[PDB]
């Protein structure tokens, strides 16, 4: 239940409140059919695409139910937090004609109220890296959706008292947007203190209490504490209530939020700078599915080890050439991962892929293909940064590995175009002197002749008809694997933001990001592992 | 604009031309006729945006109304002398000289109807004699498959092919043997009256305004008579004891939207004053080139009243005649159910879903059908679609003066409770004691201190929220201008754009402002009493018990916790401010209850449902801690009110003028002399 992804959404929990038996009389002692409903785990409705497309998928599901109703969206609160990439919002509808199924003898056996909707969380560009030094503070909100029991106290008191508008909480899933005791302008905020010294994330999850006359300062009650353990882009961990609840409010809040979520809180930093935050969880009795999201204080003070891209230095990337040519970045799971696999791909139809030798699984690159605007040929570079603990910059490295060239529409070449998938590199750790051979026709001299790829600070230009340029990146154990792209393909190139004369950084439909150069026509992506 | 008209009698389409002709010789609007053979083509054309208006009788208005055309009348014609005008024509049954037959023995006799599905030829007569045809008709429609009853029969417009009888006596002499045309010698009241003057048959089924409209020799009356309902047959002109259906009158129609009540009513009023009864020889709009009658308009009729912007077909056609136009084309073991299903009408979603839960447990004996605001829940309980609801006194007025009755009334627990009373059914009602509560934090305010301040009351048009206070404030001021009174105010149910719905908040997202359903946070008793305590207005006018049930967290939610009853005190008429616990002394006034309004149809039946599925199944006495809970429950003041500790025994005050008390009717007649209401004026049209 912690296989993370780009966007989740739980659907409201409509409880079967039809007394009379299926074919009989009124399930014998006065009850309903389904007198409780906890959640399940075939319901996290993974999403994909643009945030608008995710929202529209939810919208279209509710529409598929019924088409006249109107959807009460979330926007009218979330502006209060000025989110930009990640949102933890809600959709619902209370214009629904309730489901009735009757028996021949007039009796009834199924009744589901019309209230239909989801709670959801959606993130963009998972954080391939994170701030490193010091601690950071995010602010942001959350949303939740509970189970749907029938007597949460044993007295059937009005479902207006304990929190929510009528019929929520007692005959459908108690939810959040339908909670109406808080500082009514701002119900559910929360704060996030992240410390990378221990690669940990603590957070407070707060439900504003109620002010009688709408003047006073708030009465924040923190409802859920968050202790999460980092793992690159993602983080696992535990959501659990504090004890103030269990002590004071054993009748109003200790009655939905009453079981921890052990190892069952997942989340991911979003924004390539680790500046926004998404997450979800489900309390271990499957009774409170809740999704949350926060955002930086906008006063971003940089980190000294610059891991998180977006005004710092990249660490790990997933680079994909777009449709039939140009290159782009596809948001990064942070995960490493294929020869003649003739099976389906997530792109829609049957991937017939050919990616060879797998004696190096840390960095990946090469060919993705898929047969039944269009999508003809696929070059990818999915490379994870080095674990900065294994082997420092004192030593010597001899890299052999994978290689793939492309040119565009004309007939292209493969890994064995060098007479062998070599992509050979020699470097000394203590000097950072990357050089080697990435053959174009045969050998080193009948290829692009640029060498001495020194690394200054973090930045680098490893290179292996004058004044050329090639870029790379670290993978595997600490400085133990290498690889990147030639920065000389066309006017534009492969790899980092395209060198297309630096006019506008994709501020239009032209793509004129970065510096100029001359126009050959040849591209290549390379990578390699260490040997000794 | 060019206003058209849709003829049906195109040979007699001369009371069409003459109109635009001798109106163009005056000035002329660009009128024209767009002729067809049958009226249904005209209903199509107007729905198809091809014509503006053609008058229809009863059955034809019904057929012209339902989907997918949705036609709406605008102008209800007037019948009678220019001194005493009415719009309720009658339908009667004329006979031979002696005849010796009564309406209950018409087996094989030779009839003369007036037109397929008309309320003096087909619908009223059939329905009158329907217990005699005995047709198990899911197949075999009425037309003759069971009008074998009569052997000989003439009914113009009938499908000649299908059945043999329905135009034998219709001497049409050719393909027009059966036609719905202007050349059927036995078509209108005059034709289906010559079908009795010629003695070819006996029973003519026609209006009451013909026996004197075509018998000029005032000696030939004493033989022709009127076939009465009451087992007998009385002389002609006593028809107010011998008529058969108080039908409505042919009422010019026009589209649902863009139907232009205004435009055609304008030109029609010009013509009503210019060419009306007893006027110039320039083609009066009531007359006939002799030989025919009612030529594609009406004749022997003075004028036509204007039908208000509220009336649409179901409302226009009455209730009796509408139930009768429907419950003939559905089987007798189906439309005897509808007379046992108490279709209840809620208001807005939340009590609709309370009502659905009810329907479920009901044993299929109480369904539900809802609406948006008590105005429209009335607009349903009228046209047949829901035979009950419950509403606060000022609404018993606005409804009873639309032609309904109060059935039972929410017998609130008056201050003298003192016990749980089991005979709560037959303890006659006591009204409620409406007060004006205020927060004694501010101590400056007195009785004279109500005008121009910030204040919010409980409802619009109800007795304790908008008509007992503002009535007395009008009686002192004289300026029945209602927004100038108070600077800012939250009265739920008014316009939302004024300076009178500025201090309301609405719903969660904050969109439903002042809407009179349960989605306007400051609506209803506890609603106004929220608006005050949250300190945005000063004086509240609400029922007393609410300031009693909103301390000690009696609403255990946010706003009603933390509050004390020693924090507010009442107003008076002098200026003092006493403590609330004894509002029996210094309140604002008395007022009448709410009550369950319904129709005269199904009122011995809503004493067999509500009387024993509330007294049982019903909050104190058989179940509901678990199943029904139809009162103060999981839900608060929905579909009833949460002091409804029983249901009543109204004890005679059916004629609301006997119920509301002669003083409050006086008050609200003084009030609604400055303020109209969307309903009341249309429904005062519907008693003319
Ligand atoms: Fe008529």
Numbering used by the authors:
A (entry chain A): 42 to 365, 375 to 387, 400 to 434, 524 to 615, 637 to 704
B (entry chain B): 5 to 692
Can you provide the manuscript's text about this entry?
Crystallization with NgLbpB was unsuccessful, therefore, we used cryoEM to determine the structure of NgLbpB in complex with Lf to 3.65 Å resolution. Very good density was observed for side chains of both lobes of Lf and for the N-lobe of NgLbpB allowing unambiguous model building and refinement, however, almost no density was observed for the C-lobe of NgLbpB, unless map contours were reduced drastically. (E) Final 3D reconstruction map upon non-uniform refinement was obtained at 3.65 Å. An alignment of the Nm and NgLbpB complexes with Lf had an overall RMSD of 3.7 Å, however, an improved RMSD of 1.4 Å when aligning just along the interacting domains (C-lobe of Lf and N-lobe of LbpB), indicating a conserved binding interface between Nm and Ng. Additionally, the N-lobe of Lf in the NgLbpB–Lf cryoEM structure is positioned ~12° relatively to the NmLbpB–Lf crystal structure. Whether this structural difference in the N-lobe of Lf is just an artifact of crystal packing or if it is truly important for function in LbpB remains to be determined. (D) A zoomed view of the binding interface shows extensive interactions along an elongated surface covering both the C1 and C2 domains of Lf (buried surface area 1604 Å2). Further, we used SEC-SAXS analysis to show that in solution, NgLbpB alone and a complex with Lf match closely to those with NmLbpB. Since minimal differences were observed between the Nm and Ng samples, this supports the conclusion that LbpB has a conserved overall structure.
Lactoferrin-binding protein B (LbpB) is a lipoprotein present on the surface of Neisseria that has been postulated to serve dual functions during pathogenesis in both iron acquisition from lactoferrin (Lf), and in providing protection against the cationic antimicrobial peptide lactoferricin (Lfcn). Here, we present the structures of LbpB from N. meningitidis and N. gonorrhoeae in complex with human holo-Lf, forming a 1:1 complex and confirmed by size-exclusion chromatography small-angle X-ray scattering. LbpB consists of N- and C-lobes with the N-lobe interacting extensively with the C-lobe of Lf. Our studies provide the molecular details for how LbpB serves to capture and preserve Lf in an iron-bound state for delivery to the membrane transporter LbpA for iron piracy, and as an antimicrobial peptide sink to evade host immune defenses.
